[PDB]
């Protein structure tokens, strides 16, 4: 297939381009056409023919071809320009390949997260698992480290973290750790703990509940 | 002119994936192409076939074999068949066609995601992510829910009927060491709602037919 970076990144206002490497017979020989693939959508065109915009693509988005590359421009950047972004031609058979995909981080100003904890719930608990669930909301850079301590125990490998795709409106990522023991082990220890690192942070938060404290609505 | 893919979530492996694409807005007797096009999860585009407008068609020499593209012109509709699967094929399948005028935008279907597996479906468990002050920062409260234990992908989650999105973050499943995934999807609101307003997530999970509508109520926490 093509080659593309895997990622590229720049602040608001900015401009970047993405560059597209292929051979003689692919790009070399071919147009070439540009594609936006926000998260958990379908690719939109931007650019075909090399350079010519679709109906609906603004100005900002430019393409163009020399040999057997090829390159997207993007200007006046937007959060809402967070995507992969594709490039496709057509091979010597004239069927279509596309790149890797390149994905465009939109950089901000660090922003540190907001720490939340939920004890797990009666409901779960009466099912016979505790999954307890540590928040890190709307921080940059995508960075964390988050430390689960149980009776002071630090907990290695009993916890799983994911992370969302960048926020389209202000540039953040939230991330979710999970801390998954049986009842009965939960019902054998007291403090339940998770402690967060960032650069936003002068020093670690630490977010805290003891077993008990709560009851369900 | 819209798509929409339908067919089954989970395929078990050496069986044949079966994919439809209904076509409204457009004759499919009038498509330059419609094809189709595939996407492991966390990689790229993979063309897989099309169909021109004679009927000609047109696969990936790599999947030729396997492939077979066809049109159902009384339901304005086309298919993919794509035999013996194997965990490889595991995939986000777009369907996709070109209408109007050469130099148009394709129109794309949502995407199905089918995973190749000899795992089985599993629905489920809903359960609540309750505000309480532990879960509070200055007049934010942030409340969810976990979405565990389910099998295979993908679950979508609204809030309030899609009346609640600022705010909302649906994180990426994991897998867990059991082999089934979870998720959870959490939203930040003013401390002051908790009181007043309702907080639903809705849950869907296609492959298993379950769908829940779960109310997230304030816990009573004395800490
Ligand atoms: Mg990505």
């Known amino acids: 297939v093509l080659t593309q970076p895997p990622s590229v990144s720049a602040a608001p206002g900015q401009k970047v381009t993405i560059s597209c490497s292929g051979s003689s017979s692919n790009i070399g020989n071919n147009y070439v056409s540009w594609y936006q693939q926000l998260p958990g959508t379908a690719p939109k065109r931007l650019i075909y023919?090399?350079?010519k915009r679709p109906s609906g693509i603004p100005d900002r988005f430019s393409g163009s071809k020399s040999g057997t590359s090829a390159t997207l421009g993007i200007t006046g950047l937007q959060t809402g320009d967070e995507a992969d972004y594709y490039c496709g031609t057509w091979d010597s058979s004239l069927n279509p390949v596309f790149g890797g995909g390149t994905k465009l981080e939109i950089k901000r100003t660090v922003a540190a997260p907001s720490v939340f904890i939920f004890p797990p719930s009666d409901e779960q608990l009466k099912s016979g698992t505790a999954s307890v669930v540590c928040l890190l909301n709307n921080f940059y850079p995508r960075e964390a480290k988050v430390q689960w301590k149980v009776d002071n125990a630090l907990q290695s490998g009993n916890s799983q973290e994911s992370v969302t795709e960048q926020d389209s409106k202000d540039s953040t990522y939230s991330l979710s750790s999970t801390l998954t023991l049986s009842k009965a082990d939960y019902e054998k220890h007291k403090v339940y703990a998770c402690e967060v690192t960032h650069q936003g942070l002068s020093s670690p938060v630490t977010k805290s509940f003891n077993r008990g404290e709560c009851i369900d609505a | 002119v819209q798509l929409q893919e339908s067919g089954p979530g989970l395929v078990k492996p050496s069986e044949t994936l079966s994919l439809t694409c209904a076509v409204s807005?457009?004759?499919?007797?009038?498509?330059?192409?419609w094809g189709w096009i595939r996407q492991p999860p966390g990689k790229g585009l993979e063309w897989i076939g099309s169909?021109?407008?004679?009927?000609?068609?047109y696969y990936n020499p790599s999947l030729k074999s396997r492939v077979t593209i066809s049109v159902d012109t009384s339901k304005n509709q086309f298919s993919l068949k794509l035999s013996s699967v194997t965990a490889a094929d595991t995939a986000v399948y777009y369907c996709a066609g070109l209408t109007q005028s050469s130099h148009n935008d394709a129109n794309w279907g949502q995407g199905t995601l089918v995973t190749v597996s000899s795992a089985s479906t599993k629905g489920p468990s809903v359960f609540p992510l309750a505000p309480s002050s532990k879960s509070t920062s200055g007049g934010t409260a942030a409340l969810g829910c976990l979405v565990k234990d389910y099998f295979p992908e993908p679950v979508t989650v609204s809030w309030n009927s899609g009346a609640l999105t600022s705010g909302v973050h649906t994180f990426p499943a994991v897998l867990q060491s059991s082999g089934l995934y979870s998720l959870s999807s959490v939203v930040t609101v003013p401390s002051s709602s908790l009181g007043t307003q309702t907080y639903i997530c809705n849950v869907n999970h296609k492959p298993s037919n379950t769908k829940v509508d779960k109310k997230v109520e304030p816990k009573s926490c004395l800490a």
């Open positions: 169909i021109y407008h004679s009927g000609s068609t």
């Open positions: 023919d090399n350079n």
């Open positions: 807005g457009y004759s499919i007797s009038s498509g330059y192409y």
